Ligand binder design. Structure first.
Ligand SMILES: [Mg+2]
Ligand SMILES: [Mg+2]
Ligand SMILES: [Mg+2]
Ligand SMILES: [Mg+2]
Ligand SMILES: [Mg+2]
Ligand SMILES: [Mg+2]
Ligand SMILES: [Mg+2]
Ligand SMILES: [Mg+2]
Ligand SMILES: [Mg+2]
Ligand SMILES: [Mg+2]
Ligand SMILES: [Mg+2]
Ligand SMILES: [Mg+2]
Ligand SMILES: [Mg+2]
Ligand SMILES: [Mg+2]
Ligand SMILES: [Mg+2]
Ligand SMILES: [Mg+2]
Ligand SMILES: [Mg+2]
Ligand SMILES: [Mg+2]
Ligand SMILES: [Mg+2]
Ligand SMILES: [Mg+2]
Ligand SMILES: [Mg+2]
Ligand SMILES: [Mg+2]
Ligand SMILES: [Mg+2]
Ligand SMILES: [Zn+2]
Lengths: 91, 97, 201, 150, 226, 25, 96, 127
RNA sequence: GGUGAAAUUCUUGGAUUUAUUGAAGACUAACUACUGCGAAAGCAUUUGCCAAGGACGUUUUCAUUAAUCAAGAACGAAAGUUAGGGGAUCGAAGAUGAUCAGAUACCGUCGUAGUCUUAACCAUAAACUAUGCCGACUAGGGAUCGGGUGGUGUUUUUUUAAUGACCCACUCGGCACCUUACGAGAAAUCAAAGUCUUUGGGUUCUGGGGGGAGUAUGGUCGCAAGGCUGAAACUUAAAGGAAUUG
């Protein structure tokens, strides 16, 4: 049965700190406790160790990432622009 | 009442058309509604042709021309006399003059 | 501990003696364990490599950038920060760069930097929610927390202390030429109040 | 027409007037029946069987050549599919669209067309339950359907 | 506006053309006429050298002026100075572009405009982007008045144009590409390849731009000059 | 007045009435 | 397409899935083709290439990871490498 | 026989610019505008101010040494009008009549493939 | 620079203008039309991948499985809301220069939110063809888009085959247009808005003089803005439509 209508994991916080702060915490907590696809072994086994450290429990690889998600949008765009500049260095 | 069967525009079977801006005032008007004209102009304005011809270093110089497409809103076209208000029966005449 | 960004232990061979050296780099985002890192003038434009700034094109994103060649990293070291290479000037070899604060610096093109963004970004987007979370944060940094307001103090303890109400009294904008013991408040402030309009960086 | 569009197409077969046919065709009913059976053993739907017989052989239509229709021949020879052919094709189109949707959550048009396809599936399934070629309590579910495609 | 300047300066006359000296621009041997014209630069002094100010310059000259024929009047060639010897500057190829009047005269209503571009490397390590344009045309005896293509024609035409352009630029050096672009043989090649797809008219190589140059070769430049 | 601005005035009045009733309750 | 050729091979031919059985088939010489997923570790990939060089067996590099290769061979589990032992009524050996 | 510059007339509304550069465009000879020759902001873009400006750039070009010009005519362009102002024609005719020789007229008004956004709002400039 | 004319603003520390390079975000000119697609909102650079769709062709197959739909559901411009990113342009607010009796308006120069994107909300527009859907029939005319059929038709290839592109004839399905009015209508006008006092093909929704009023109240959805549902007391002889002459 559905125990909570909208608080989810932030139901651990009770009635404290304000609903808007609890919402932002909920959005970031879901991301940091989510399991992620491993780009080396191909399984959904990547979990956060501390802020910025993402380890696959299967193949034991560890990737540096965002504080609460395995990859930030800024890092994705930096990867894209570095690949473009690298390709221009040859062509 | 309804003035025009075309509703003052040209959009049968679309719904939405991307707009353009009036060249005179920058009013946003849909592309099918605007008053497109084609300004194809000599570069030397027909009174300096002789002067530029005698000042040219080349014989038989081709003397290019300028091309511009002008988009007008209804207010600016009527105010600038590009189109003018026609009679009720003559409103239906689609042909250029 | 005390740092928002993760670190990378990278092992190189010593070129003059048979052993192994370990360096503590700041991990760039996307660097993984078992990755080969290339440091040098001839290294390729890949995330994690340690090129000098004169050998990267314009628009390159780097981090852990030397202010001067050889001081082994000064600029854009906190999580999510980076430096953008604006331009080069080969005669009188200088590189113009954009710092995280928006400042434009002209440094030597022999200064090195790490291609990519410092990992761990987005951290300050999470609300701490709790005095205890602030406690545990500063327990590993320094004794700068909690902070008593100077206007809650007595006048023996602070320029803002005292009064039959809690109020500052004089203006809180304090000159650059003030002396220590006077410099509490907004020091050398060009303007105050809520930032309306562009800052014109 | 077009229950799920505004199309008004009239494109169809126009079968001939002559119910016995076609006086240049010399094969026998048992020969074309055994061809129908060998195609069905090779695993072809009645639509595909009719197309191959109409095209490679000269079989105008099996109802006028033989006594009865291809689905009846298949059933009598024990090769009837578990679900009817059109419902099977509708189900497999639905599973392909649903797989595409989990790949592409932001495909709103694909979400719309999935709704249309599954509505059409449920309408045929209700008809087939009413005429009892499908058992009562036969339900289309997505999770079972992906394996029902086989 | 001769008297409206409130302050001339925040802080509150020698003729420079006495200091300036002339140099002669030289086109490569691929073009017929070497003498392009003249430029100015300040005389070389201790602080500033004249060749440093000269080596960056780009001169856009009409191909009709380069080749002596008026059928080239709608194409412009950019020539970039690379070396200063004596009193004349040596230029290499830097780009090609149509003229605005020619492009706008080619673009007309009731036809289809087809465009293609390829990025491709030459034999001597020049990276180029080549832009080609074409237009649908009516047949003779055609009575309908607009002559459009059906978009799969456009895709097929763009494919054959792109493969022809890559084949022509690859395996040729930059000088050989210039010597191909002058007679416009690529236009005839595109016409012969596309004549089975749709009739087409005004087939052109509209632009060539240099994305990347190789490391500078004085040997190649004096191969071009002389 | 113009109907759009009459609608705006009505919406402002409705919001003010809600605030006053919330003061009451 | 390569996915269609693989589907036809799964329908009417002989194949094996997985690294151990693929290496066994390479040693026994029964393998006609090996297809390696994109995200296969480079050590395993170079080992399979060395085995295929000894066996004179063709190697195809499947774009997409082991999840996509498993979907392509029509299995609900991820497949790192697939060895085609007999292609029946398929042209995957003749092409590519 | 002839030594060439380029003429580079920029005729906007509110002003006209006539200035001759070398064949590379890097070295300038005689930048004179229509606002340098009148005393009114109205008359800054008049044909008469333009012909005065063209006469003086032609005098300075004849004194420097340039005998012929390649003309590049220009309107404001971008998101703006792309119609040349009232003074460009007068400047071109004055440059022709001054004694300079002309070759290779071209219009170089900057035309966008799909501009940023025009000024004025969607209701336009209300007059 | 701007304008009807100006001023605010920037300029010997060099503005504007020219040249050479570079970066960023947005947009997709011209081609572009009484043309195409989509349930509508909407959709315009290339190429690849992913699934979808109509029409046409069909001597394939099933066989009445259909039409329209209370309840219930998906999508739903722009603005707006929350949180990251981005933040070049334009630009609600605001600052300013004019104009003016005033001018916190129009005009000028700046400029925050916004404009773009990701995740989640919101459910409205003159969301218009102000024209519900499905079916049948009733006047002529040419053009056009997609498919199909025919012609010793034209052109191109290898003069000559097949293709392709055109031309002509027909056909199915579209977006439309022109002419008439048998017919309809208060008229404007309409090939449907006709086949309606000679009044019945099937079905959903909505209106009953003008205001009060999309208000109050009660539900319900929404973080909010608000949406959906929705009166009455009281007031009033006209409001309103289409045309005529001034
Ligand atoms: Mg009116
Ligand atoms: Mg609309
Ligand atoms: Mg403490
Ligand atoms: Mg405190
Ligand atoms: Mg106290
Ligand atoms: Mg004190
Ligand atoms: Mg005090
Ligand atoms: Mg007290
Ligand atoms: Mg029908
Ligand atoms: Mg229906
Ligand atoms: Mg300057
Ligand atoms: Mg375009
Ligand atoms: Mg089209
Ligand atoms: Mg204001
Ligand atoms: Mg509504
Ligand atoms: Mg309506
Ligand atoms: Mg009807
Ligand atoms: Mg047709
Ligand atoms: Mg038709
Ligand atoms: Mg249509
Ligand atoms: Mg009533
Ligand atoms: Mg009423
Ligand atoms: Mg009236
Ligand atoms: Zn793993």
């Amino acid at each position: 049965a559905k125990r909570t209508k909208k608080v989810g994991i932030t139901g651990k916080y009770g009635v404290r700190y304000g609903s808007s702060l609890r919402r932002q915490v909920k959005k970031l907590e879901i991301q940091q406790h989510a399991r992620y696809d491993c780009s080396f072994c191909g399984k959904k086994t990547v979990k956060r160790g501390a802020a910025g450290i993402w380890t696959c429990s299967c193949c034991k690889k560890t990737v540096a990432g965002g504080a609460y998600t395995v990859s930030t949008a800024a890092a994705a765009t930096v990867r894209s622009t570095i690949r473009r500049l690298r390709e221009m260095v040859e062509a | 009442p309804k003035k025009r069967a075309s509703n003052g525009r040209n959009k049968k079977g679309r719904g939405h058309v991307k707009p353009v801006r009036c060249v005179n005032c920058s009013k946003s008007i849909p592309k099918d509604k605007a008053i497109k004209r084609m300004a194809i102009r000599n570069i030397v304005e027909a009174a300096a042709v002789r002067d530029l011809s005698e000042a040219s270093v080349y014989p038989e110089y081709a003397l290019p021309k300028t091309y511009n497409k002008l988009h007008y809103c209804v207010s600016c076209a009527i105010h600038a006399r590009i189109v003018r208000v026609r009679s009720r029966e003559d409103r239906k005449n689609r042909a250029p003059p | 501990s005390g740092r928002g960004a993760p670190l990378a232990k990278v092992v190189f061979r010593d070129p003059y003696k048979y052993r192994l050296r370990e360096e503590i780099f700041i991990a760039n985002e996307g660097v993984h364990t078992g990755q080969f890192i290339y440091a040098g003038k001839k290294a390729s434009l890949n995330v994690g490599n340690v090129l000098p700034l004169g050998s990267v094109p314009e628009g390159t994103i780097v981090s852990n950038v030397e202010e001067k060649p050889g001081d082994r990293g000064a600029l854009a070291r906190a999580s999510g920060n980076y430096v953008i290479i604006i331009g080069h000037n080969p005669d009188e070899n200088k590189t113009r760069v954009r710092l995280p604060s928006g400042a434009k610096k002209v440094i030597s093109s022999d200064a090195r930097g790490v291609i990519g963004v410092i990992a761990g970004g987005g951290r300050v987007d999470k609300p701490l929610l709790k005095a205890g979370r602030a406690f545990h944060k500063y327990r590993l940094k320094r004794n700068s927390w909690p902070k008593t307001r100077g206007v809650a103090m007595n006048p023996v303890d602070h320029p803002h202390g005292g009064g039959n109400h809690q109020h500052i009294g004089k203006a809180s904008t304090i000159s650059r030429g003030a002396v220590s013991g006077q410099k509490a408040g907004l020091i050398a402030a060009r303007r105050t109040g809520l930032l309306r309009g562009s800052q014109k960086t | 027409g077009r229950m799920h569009s505004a199309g008004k197409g009239i494109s169809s077969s126009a079968i001939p007037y002559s119910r016995n046919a076609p006086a240049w065709f010399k094969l026998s009913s048992e020969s074309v029946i055994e061809q129908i059976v060998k195609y069905a053993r090779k695993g072809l739907t009645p639509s595909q069987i009719g197309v191959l017989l109409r095209d490679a052989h000269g079989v105008t239509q099996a109802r006028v050549i033989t006594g009865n229709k291809i689905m009846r021949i298949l059933k009598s020879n024990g090769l009837a599919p578990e679900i009817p052919e059109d419902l099977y094709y509708l189900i497999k189109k639905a599973v392909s669209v649903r797989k595409h949707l989990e790949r592409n959550r932001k495909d709103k048009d694909a979400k719309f067309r999935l709704i249309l396809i599954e509505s059409r599936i449920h309408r045929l399934a209700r008809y087939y339950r009413t005429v009892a070629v499908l058992p009562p309590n036969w339900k289309y579910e997505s999770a079972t359907a992906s394996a029902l495609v086989n | 506006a001769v008297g409206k300047n409130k302050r001339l300066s925040k802080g509150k006359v020698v003729d420079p053309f006495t200091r300036k000296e002339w140099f002669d621009i030289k086109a490569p041997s691929t073009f017929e006429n070497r003498n392009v014209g003249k430029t100015l630069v300040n005389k070389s002094t201790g602080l500033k050298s004249a060749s440093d100010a000269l080596k960056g310059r780009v001169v856009e000259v009409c191909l009709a002026d380069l080749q002596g024929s008026e059928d080239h009047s709608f194409r412009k060639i950019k020539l970039r100075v690379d070396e200063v010897q004596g009193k004349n500057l040596l230029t290499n190829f830097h780009g090609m572009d149509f003229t605005t009047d020619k492009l706008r005269s080619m673009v007309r209503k009731w036809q289809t405009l087809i465009e293609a571009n390829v990025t491709v490397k030459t034999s001597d390590d020049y990276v180029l982007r080549i832009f080609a344009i074409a237009f649908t045309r009516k047949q003779a005896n055609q009575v309908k008045r607009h002559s459009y293509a059906q978009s799969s024609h456009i895709r097929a035409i763009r494919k054959v144009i792109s493969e022809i352009l890559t084949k022509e630029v690859q395996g040729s050096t930059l000088a050989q590409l210039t010597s191909k672009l002058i007679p416009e043989v690529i236009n005839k090649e595109i016409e012969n390849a596309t004549k089975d797809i749709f009739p087409l008219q005004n087939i052109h190589v509209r632009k060539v731009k240099l994305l990347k140059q190789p490391k500078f070769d004085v040997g190649a430049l004096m191969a071009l000059h002389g | 007045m113009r109907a759009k601005w009459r609608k705006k005035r009505t919406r402002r009045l409705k919001r003010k009435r809600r605030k006053v009733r919330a003061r009451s309750k | 397409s390569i996915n269609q050729k693989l589907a036809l091979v799964i329908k009417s031919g002989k194949y094996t899935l997985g690294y151990k059985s693929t290496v066994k088939s390479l040693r026994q010489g029964k393998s006609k083709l090996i297809i390696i997923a994109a995200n296969t570790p480079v050590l395993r990939k170079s080992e399979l290439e060395y085995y295929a060089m000894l066996s004179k067996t063709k190697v195809y590099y499947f774009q997409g990871g082991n999840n996509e290769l498993g979907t392509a061979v029509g299995k609900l589990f991820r497949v790192g490498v697939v060895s085609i032992l007999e292609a029946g009524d398929s042209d995957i050996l003749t092409t590519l | 026989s002839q030594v060439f510059g380029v003429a580079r007339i920029y005729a906007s509304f509110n002003d006209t610019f006539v200035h001759v550069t070398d064949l590379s465009g890097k070295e300038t000879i005689a930048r004179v505008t229509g606002g340098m020759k009148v005393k009114a902001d109205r008359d800054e873009s008049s044909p008469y101010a333009a012909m005065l400006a063209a006469q003086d750039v032609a005098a300075k070009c004849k004194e420097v040494g340039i005998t012929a010009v390649h003309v590049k005519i220009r309107a404001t362009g971008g998101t703006r009008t792309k119609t040349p102002g009232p003074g460009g024609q007068a400047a071109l005719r004055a440059l022709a009549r001054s004694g300079l020789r002309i070759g290779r007229i071209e219009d170089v008004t900057p035309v966008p493939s799909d501009s940023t956004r025009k000024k004025g709002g969607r209701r336009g400039r209300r007059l």
